[PDB]
Design a protein around this ligand. Sequence first.
Ligand SMILES: CCCCCCCCCCCCCCCCCC(=O)OC[C@H](COP(=O)([O-])OCC(O)COP(=O)([O-])OC[C@@H](COC(=O)CCCCCCCCCCCCCCCCC)OC(=O)CCCCCCCCCCCCCCCCC)OC(=O)CCCCCCCCCCCCCCCCC
Ligand SMILES: CCCCCCCCCCCCCCCCCC(=O)OC[C@H](COP(=O)([O-])OCC(O)COP(=O)([O-])OC[C@@H](COC(=O)CCCCCCCCCCCCCCCCC)OC(=O)CCCCCCCCCCCCCCCCC)OC(=O)CCCCCCCCCCCCCCCCC
Ligand SMILES: CCCCCCCCCCCCCCCCCC(=O)OC[C@H](COP(=O)([O-])OCC(O)COP(=O)([O-])OC[C@@H](COC(=O)CCCCCCCCCCCCCCCCC)OC(=O)CCCCCCCCCCCCCCCCC)OC(=O)CCCCCCCCCCCCCCCCC
Ligand SMILES: CCCCCCCCCCCCCCCCCC(=O)OC[C@H](COP(=O)([O-])OCC(O)COP(=O)([O-])OC[C@@H](COC(=O)CCCCCCCCCCCCCCCCC)OC(=O)CCCCCCCCCCCCCCCCC)OC(=O)CCCCCCCCCCCCCCCCC
Ligand SMILES: CCCCCCCCCCCCCCCCCC(=O)OC[C@H](COP(=O)([O-])OCC[N+](C)(C)C)OC(=O)CCCCCCCCCCCCCCCCC
Ligand SMILES: CCCCCCCCCCCCCCCCCC(=O)OC[C@H](COP(=O)([O-])OCC[N+](C)(C)C)OC(=O)CCCCCCCCCCCCCCCCC
Ligand SMILES: CCCCCCCCCCCCCCCCCC(=O)OC[C@H](COP(=O)([O-])OCC[N+](C)(C)C)OC(=O)CCCCCCCCCCCCCCCCC
Ligand SMILES: CCCCCCCCCCCCCCCC(=O)OC[C@H](COP(=O)(O)O)OC(=O)CCCCCCCCCCCCCCC
Ligand SMILES: Nc1ncnc2c1ncn2[C@@H]1O[C@H](COP(=O)(O)OP(=O)(O)O)[C@@H](O)[C@H]1O
Lengths: 67, 136, 177, 505, 102, 178, 125, 125
Amino acid sequence: GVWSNIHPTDKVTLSFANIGRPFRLIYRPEIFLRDQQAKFIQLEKEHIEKSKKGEFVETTSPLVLWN
Amino acid sequence: MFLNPVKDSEFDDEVKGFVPSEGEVRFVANKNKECGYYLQGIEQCRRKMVQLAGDSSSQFHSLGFLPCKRLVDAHYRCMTDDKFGSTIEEVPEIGLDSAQKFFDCTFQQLKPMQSCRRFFDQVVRDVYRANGSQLI
Amino acid sequence: AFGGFRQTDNSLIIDDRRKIILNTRSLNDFQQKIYLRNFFTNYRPDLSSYDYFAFKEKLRIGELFLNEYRKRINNEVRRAAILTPTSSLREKMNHKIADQILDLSSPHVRGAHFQAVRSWTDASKIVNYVEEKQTKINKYGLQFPLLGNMTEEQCASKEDEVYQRLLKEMQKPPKKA
Amino acid sequence: MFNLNTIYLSRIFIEFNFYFLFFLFLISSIIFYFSKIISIQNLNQNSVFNFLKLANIFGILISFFIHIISFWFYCIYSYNLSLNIFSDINLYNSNSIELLNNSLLPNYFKSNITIDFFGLILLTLAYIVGFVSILALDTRLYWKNIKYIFSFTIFLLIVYVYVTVSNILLFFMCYELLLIPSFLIVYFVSPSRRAIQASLYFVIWTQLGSLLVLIAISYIISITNTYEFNDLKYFNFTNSESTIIIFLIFLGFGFKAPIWPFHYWLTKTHVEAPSGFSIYLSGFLVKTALYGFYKFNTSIFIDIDSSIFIAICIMGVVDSSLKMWGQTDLKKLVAYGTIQEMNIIYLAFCWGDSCAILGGILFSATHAFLSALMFFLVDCIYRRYHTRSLVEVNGILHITPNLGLSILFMLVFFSGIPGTIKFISEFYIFSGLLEASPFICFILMLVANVLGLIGFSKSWFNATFGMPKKNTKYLPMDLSFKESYIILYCFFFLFIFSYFSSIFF
Amino acid sequence: MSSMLIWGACFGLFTRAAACKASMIPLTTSPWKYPKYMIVSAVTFYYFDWYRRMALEQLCYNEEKLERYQIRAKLQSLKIGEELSDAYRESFFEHAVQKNNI
Amino acid sequence: MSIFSNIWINNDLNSYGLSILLLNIINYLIVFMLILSVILLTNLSKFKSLNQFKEFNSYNFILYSLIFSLLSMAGIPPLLGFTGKFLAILYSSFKSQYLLILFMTILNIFGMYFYIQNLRFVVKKNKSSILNYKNYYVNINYSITLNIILLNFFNFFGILFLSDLIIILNYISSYIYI
Amino acid sequence: MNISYTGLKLEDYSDEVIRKYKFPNSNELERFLNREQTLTVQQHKSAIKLAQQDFFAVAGLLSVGSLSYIFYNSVGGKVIRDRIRASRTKAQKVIVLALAFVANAAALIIARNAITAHNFGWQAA
Amino acid sequence: NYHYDFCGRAYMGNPAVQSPPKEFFNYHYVPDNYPDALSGFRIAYRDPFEVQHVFAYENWEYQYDGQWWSMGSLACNVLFFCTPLFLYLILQVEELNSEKRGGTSNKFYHNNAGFFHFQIYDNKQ
Ligand SMILES: CCCCCCCCCCCCCCCCCC(=O)OC[C@H](COP(=O)([O-])OCC(O)COP(=O)([O-])OC[C@@H](COC(=O)CCCCCCCCCCCCCCCCC)OC(=O)CCCCCCCCCCCCCCCCC)OC(=O)CCCCCCCCCCCCCCCCC
Ligand SMILES: CCCCCCCCCCCCCCCCCC(=O)OC[C@H](COP(=O)([O-])OCC(O)COP(=O)([O-])OC[C@@H](COC(=O)CCCCCCCCCCCCCCCCC)OC(=O)CCCCCCCCCCCCCCCCC)OC(=O)CCCCCCCCCCCCCCCCC
Ligand SMILES: CCCCCCCCCCCCCCCCCC(=O)OC[C@H](COP(=O)([O-])OCC(O)COP(=O)([O-])OC[C@@H](COC(=O)CCCCCCCCCCCCCCCCC)OC(=O)CCCCCCCCCCCCCCCCC)OC(=O)CCCCCCCCCCCCCCCCC
Ligand SMILES: CCCCCCCCCCCCCCCCCC(=O)OC[C@H](COP(=O)([O-])OCC(O)COP(=O)([O-])OC[C@@H](COC(=O)CCCCCCCCCCCCCCCCC)OC(=O)CCCCCCCCCCCCCCCCC)OC(=O)CCCCCCCCCCCCCCCCC
Ligand SMILES: CCCCCCCCCCCCCCCCCC(=O)OC[C@H](COP(=O)([O-])OCC[N+](C)(C)C)OC(=O)CCCCCCCCCCCCCCCCC
Ligand SMILES: CCCCCCCCCCCCCCCCCC(=O)OC[C@H](COP(=O)([O-])OCC[N+](C)(C)C)OC(=O)CCCCCCCCCCCCCCCCC
Ligand SMILES: CCCCCCCCCCCCCCCCCC(=O)OC[C@H](COP(=O)([O-])OCC[N+](C)(C)C)OC(=O)CCCCCCCCCCCCCCCCC
Ligand SMILES: CCCCCCCCCCCCCCCC(=O)OC[C@H](COP(=O)(O)O)OC(=O)CCCCCCCCCCCCCCC
Ligand SMILES: Nc1ncnc2c1ncn2[C@@H]1O[C@H](COP(=O)(O)OP(=O)(O)O)[C@@H](O)[C@H]1O
């Protein structure tokens, strides 16, 4: 309930299991991943624009991010 | 799975099992471990597209699952090591049938990814069996 | 996120695929994951989690099935001993029955040993044999109450399918030779 | 024909039995605390101690009945789940059924309950052995230790969370929680004066292994940030990490589950502990360690030879069996028997997740019941004859025929006669060990079932037989109904549990 | 359950009862201290909830800055000669040229 | 620290060891405060030797408060000191210091027995009289008893609320740019 | 996020590609969205309600039976209990004998019902 | 053959009659212990020799360093000491046999990919 309402995981597990990991990763992992992928997002956008255009870029092809 | 039908069978349906080569098993395991991100992405994007344009009256109802095309192509390239084409549509004829089965599993029947990964791995295994030394 | 443990060895690692050279002690978490820790720890690493759970269950059932073969042949030997007098008993046993008894020995069936030492190929073969038996049973749908669960509509559809299959098989002509 | 109704009934029963126990404990504690200014017994017929005893006893009993029902539901559920997974072979079809939680009670510690056959066997052992021990400690609880009437309810709650959780950290915490109540019981409830030192020895010896297991858990958690107990499938430990983890886990859990040479604390505690608490200790508190070792070693992939661990277990078995002869103290002799059986059980877990686990589980159950029986017999002997030494005790049969008969049948059951789960477990373990290493199996069987058996039987036969000519004015009468029915129930379980479904064994 | 105020009130009630039991005085002694303890506990625990949530938010914000320190600290921690190596040369130039935008 | 096309990824929080050290210091201070409050509630002149631990053999509140405080100092799992010791070992494992873990464990077990042995002396033949007399009656301080009760509650249930304290300590330490 | 319908035109993609990535029937889409392909959320809720009711009934019956048996058969020694039951009225004796048995039997029957799946529609032949 | 006069190093009680011990270890109870009062609470006076035997072994201790090797028989003591190594070496030889044949070896088998015995594996909506 209230004391654990901050996080779905239990308080004891939060206190002990998570050692050294960023609280940004523990809470709100999506924002952490998006910040990590910031440049990859623009690379993927440029790759999509070029693919719509005639050019096809193979260097950035693996960058297909969904989170 | 891993069962071959008996060509000369007294009854309608008979199957004899076979064990894939160690090289094939290693290749499939490594590629699954490396490209597991794309399969989860396919699942999540499928659910997202169904939620967004599931309703018939939705504006994007005519573009269903097209965004998942990039994920599917990326997964195919990752599994095949960027060889044998840069798109799923470029799959060889040996694995074309398995690719069609996978698409029916995923998008038409909307069956679990547990089920559809079987067909995707079947496509990969067919390509590997066809080539052998080309993938390793 | 997965992490790693600092390494102490001073060996050099060569990754021909990425065309780089690393040192074991200098590896970070991701590099350790990529180079070390990659080894397989199951018979069929290629299969997914659900697929390998099914594979494990089928392997266990196949081991039990081979043990059941051994138990059945032992029971048949007991039946032969009781029915037939000692005279001609060995003469009749020196047939399919004795060969099967020897062929179902410990290396082929794990009677009471803690572990059946099987290669991954052997496990795959056993699972394939179990799947062949399952397919043969499911052709006629004998697994509704045992070795299966289905709803009423599923049962009715399976009954219709099995009826059609039996009709087609009966209409088929005898196999030549 | 399996339907979702059975699945949800099983899950609901498992989840709600814990809350039943918790609410009973909470209400009893509230009454105890708020009925009196000072939480001690009022030496009169209208004391709250009677109500607390009633509540504890018939909360444990009712929860045990509900646990029987829930265990049967789990057996059906697991069998049908395996059938559902195995039966279907069509590639398109896959068993993906998702269950939605109830809206009545919350998930304790925000953890989804997962139940296994070994865990439920451990929980059933907890229930039964706790019932026996609480029935035993009535004469010990008096006027300042009545607060320990809830100790077995606390044990039940801890074990329930321990066995119905899929979290590594919660698992370890539940395993570690057991120390405080047991130490308090030994410290404040043991009549003998040597119990003061026995408690310290118990604490230190068990805490060394607890620290070892803590180091192993820290290695697992720091390297793998996961806690779900199943994400370890996707992470592989290097050879060095795996060997360190297995060594630490084995030594730490063997500190609790007595192994050679770490059984000095066990002998001291059994000798100097309450006769009612020794039953619970030997029966259950040494098997949580076995369960934890099984879970961890089956979760982790280990690429090391288990010859060293097997040798340690066999050495412990041989040591206990040889020392059995020289013990004139019945309680210490039973403690050595417990050491032997626990070492055999631990050896049964030295082959990873092989078929030896089934024999280990069955032997754990039979050892729990047999040790409960033996310690209860020792308790009766000590309580009616004011001594538990062979030199001072002789000719029990001729003055208390029922007690002598119980001793003789206990010896017969300990011998491992066919028709008993003891014999079944011995058969499993020895059948596996014969193919694993036949000469080692022969040595183990010879020692344990001849030399140790003879040493064990010598003292019990000498006590049962003879002629009690000494202190004729002070001789006791016989067993009471409570003791007689406890012995009969132990025998009945040891005999009839062999008919349990063979699917799980 | 969900109301920190109610949780604090219950905590204060039980604290008062436990204090009475420990002091061996009747639980009805100083009745006015029950509502006092309940109110004080409710208020303090409500404030502590708000403060823990604020501290978590501010820590999440500070971790963003701490990441910038880690990236630059890692580059400065490189052993002599590794700053121009193929594995760090591009990042070092990025942090020494592109970010030299003062 | 991982590099992927000049993109740095950091899955480690550097300002965590300092938080763990602060947590250990705070936990030790809390337990020391509990034991010293128990002592101050009673008469000070009685306690002058390890044998005098029997003098704590007084009514249940004092007796069990001392017992649980000693166990917490020793590091018994459910109590508060275990949180600090376990988190220290966890951080040592995270930093990959097996020898440091070994020496920490040796010191921990030796100190554990050092604390535990006093429970043997706590046993007393009778009930002690360690309370100061005021107005012809023993003086029991309600305020100190209440403080000891709060400390006992936190010592018992620190594991439940430790996540909030860890969050606060990490928040405080994050301001340090190390 | 670049995974969106924005910028997508059916002209760019081939007819076969569109047919492959075409939405399935509306019923299939609804089933997939609601996760009711095999079982309905209402079926799950009904099963949960039945499970909770069965657990409550079983636990209450077990408690009532156990307590009644204890209080009826825990009055004293054999002679005292026999004399008390002899002085006991007819209806009181009937309830004393029947209450515990009926409660325990009802609990056990309710437990057996769940494992016994008699209400299956395939019963025929 | 064992006689007290000629035993020398295989110690045992002397046959000669001895006076009862004046002082010996005795049963002691925790302070404020609740007496055990089963069967009328009748306690008999304990025999000094019997009590001495009861409490002798617990208090027995070695007088000097290294006495353990010499006491009893050196050969049997050394064999008992070396027993764990004998067991380990026998296990290793049996494992040599297992390796060269193909039977069960002493290793932690991992057939199940972390799947516990008959564990309930489920997901929630
Ligand atoms: C959504 C929320 C969900 C979560 C829940 C959150 C809420 C949690 C809390 C829940 C409870 C709510 C309580 C609200 C009021 C709180 C007020 C307050 O500040 O409290 C602390 C404060 C007490 O602290 P303190 O005295 O300042 O502390 C001194 C130190 O100890 C130092 O000690 P000392 O030794 O130095 O001195 C001892 C003390 C000795 O003195 C005392 O004994 C203290 C005073 C006690 C008696 C007070 C008078 C009572 C009668 C009149 C009350 C006012 C009218 C109420 C109108 C209600 C109409 C509906 O000395 C003094 O006299 C010093 C204080 C001077 C007097 C202070 C007067 C304050 C009056 C406050 C009135 C509150 C109600 C107002 C409501 C207005 C409505 C319009 O006030 C009280 O607690 C007053 C007593 C109230 C409880 C009485 C209990 C015994 C009688 C029970 C009778 C029950 C009958 C009905 C039965 C029904 C069931 C069958
Ligand atoms: C008047 C008070 C009435 C209270 C009613 C209950 C309400 C809750 C308590 C609130 C009290 C607030 C004020 C503090 C008073 C206590 C301190 C004191 O000095 O008082 C002196 C005051 C007067 O002094 P005295 O009585 O003369 O001196 C006696 C000494 O205190 C010696 O006494 P003692 O030996 O009896 O003391 C207890 C003894 C031993 O105490 C115990 O062993 C406690 C056993 C509790 C039963 C449940 C345990 C279940 C375990 C499952 C496994 C979980 C694993 C999780 C992973 C992490 C590891 C935990 O010491 C410990 O507690 C140390 C071991 C701690 C183990 C940690 C267990 C954590 C479990 C968390 C709750 C789980 C709930 C799940 C279900 C809900 C799901 C949504 O003492 C009393 O009146 C008696 C106090 C005894 C303890 C009361 C609490 C026991 C019942 C707890 C039920 C609720 C669960 C716990 C969570 C509570 C919220 C955080
Ligand atoms: C997981 C591990 C966790 C470890 C925890 C370690 C600590 C545990 C034990 C200590 C905790 C603090 C307990 C309260 C203070 C003691 C005095 C007291 O209030 O009782 C006497 C007083 C007794 O009254 P009485 O019996 O009617 O009459 C007494 C005398 O007759 C007449 O009395 P008087 O006239 O002489 O004096 C009355 C005055 C006496 O009060 C005092 O003088 C208080 C003395 C303590 C001062 C230090 C408090 C610091 C609080 C912050 C957190 C750190 C705590 C550190 C504690 C240990 C340090 C050595 O009473 C008050 O006003 C009490 C107010 C207490 C709340 C103070 C809040 C200050 C916050 C300041 C920082 C704010 C954040 C800034 C952020 C900056 C960002 C830029 O108690 C009450 O009135 C209520 C008693 C029952 C409810 C107590 C509720 C306590 C809640 C504690 C929450 C702790 C934090 C949240 C949990 C954290 C972990 C998850
Ligand atoms: C490494 C290669 C191995 C393979 C090659 C073949 C085997 C060679 C083994 C070595 C044989 C020759 C050396 C043995 C000398 C005696 C032992 C010794 O030193 O201890 C001090 C010896 C024993 O003193 P104590 O035991 O402290 O005092 C007892 C009093 O007698 C009072 O006693 P009590 O009247 O109360 O009666 C107790 C008596 C009776 O005790 C009993 O009835 C209880 C059971 C005792 C154990 C009986 C042996 C069972 C089978 C052993 C299997 C071991 C397997 C594990 C080791 C494998 C290593 C390969 O206890 C004794 O057994 C004591 C006598 C000495 C031990 C004899 C048995 C063990 C010897 C070692 C055998 C090793 C075999 C290895 C091959 C295994 C097969 C693969 O002290 C004396 O010198 C006093 C005289 C004692 C009688 C001596 C009998 C004549 C022995 C031959 C002498 C000439 C040796 C020339 C050596 C040449 C240079 C290399
Ligand atoms: C917000 C809601 C909070 C709910 C709090 C619950 C309050 C509980 C109060 C308990 C009071 C106990 C004493 C009652 C008076 C007894 C009078 C008496 O002896 O006369 C005989 C009468 C009737 O006796 P009888 O001779 O008719 O025997 C038949 C007994 N029954 C009716 C139960 C079938 O009362 C009883 O027998 C009641 C016995 C009560 C004690 C039971 C102890 C066993 C454990 C359960 C205790 C309660 C905990 C909660 C339930 C368990 C967990 C789910
Ligand atoms: C039995 C002793 C008395 C009872 C108390 C118990 C204390 C000992 C508990 C067991 C500790 C582990 C021992 C076995 C280790 C096996 C692995 C190994 O070291 O092989 C070299 C291993 C395995 O090497 P490898 O050759 O197999 O493979 C890796 C090889 N390289 C690195 C070259 C690629 O090598 C290492 O990486 C070195 C690790 C050394 C770790 C030693 C310290 C451990 C500290 C944590 C535990 C401390 C517990 C203390 C408890 C309190 C004591 C009072
Ligand atoms: C619009 C607002 C209107 C508000 C109106 C005012 C409401 C006032 C309510 C007062 C309730 C008092 C209940 C007393 C119960 C006593 C029970 C009993 O006898 O037990 C004795 C027992 C026994 O005490 P004892 O120690 O004397 O024991 C006697 C027994 N022998 C002889 C064996 C020793 O102790 C107690 O339980 C009494 C002390 C605890 C009292 C707790 C009171 C809590 C009150 C909470 C009020 C919450 C209000 C929230 C309002 C929110 C508004 C938004
Ligand atoms: C002994 C009867 C047992 C009946 C079987 C179900 C027992 C469930 C657990 C009950 C525990 C004690 C009450 C707790 C109250 C509380 O604080 O309960 C508080 C919580 C409130 O939960 P939330 O606040 O999260 O909503 O109660 C619940 O969650 C549900 C309580 C139980 C509901 C069923 C009640 C059945 C009544 C049967 C009456 C006849 C009994 C006859 C006995 C002889
Ligand atoms: N505890 C003992 N230790 C050694 N010898 C004993 C012991 N008890 C009896 N004996 C032996 O028993 C014999 C004496 O028998 P006993 O019953 O005492 O009759 P009595 O003393 O009248 O001869 C002696 O040989 C003596 O050595």
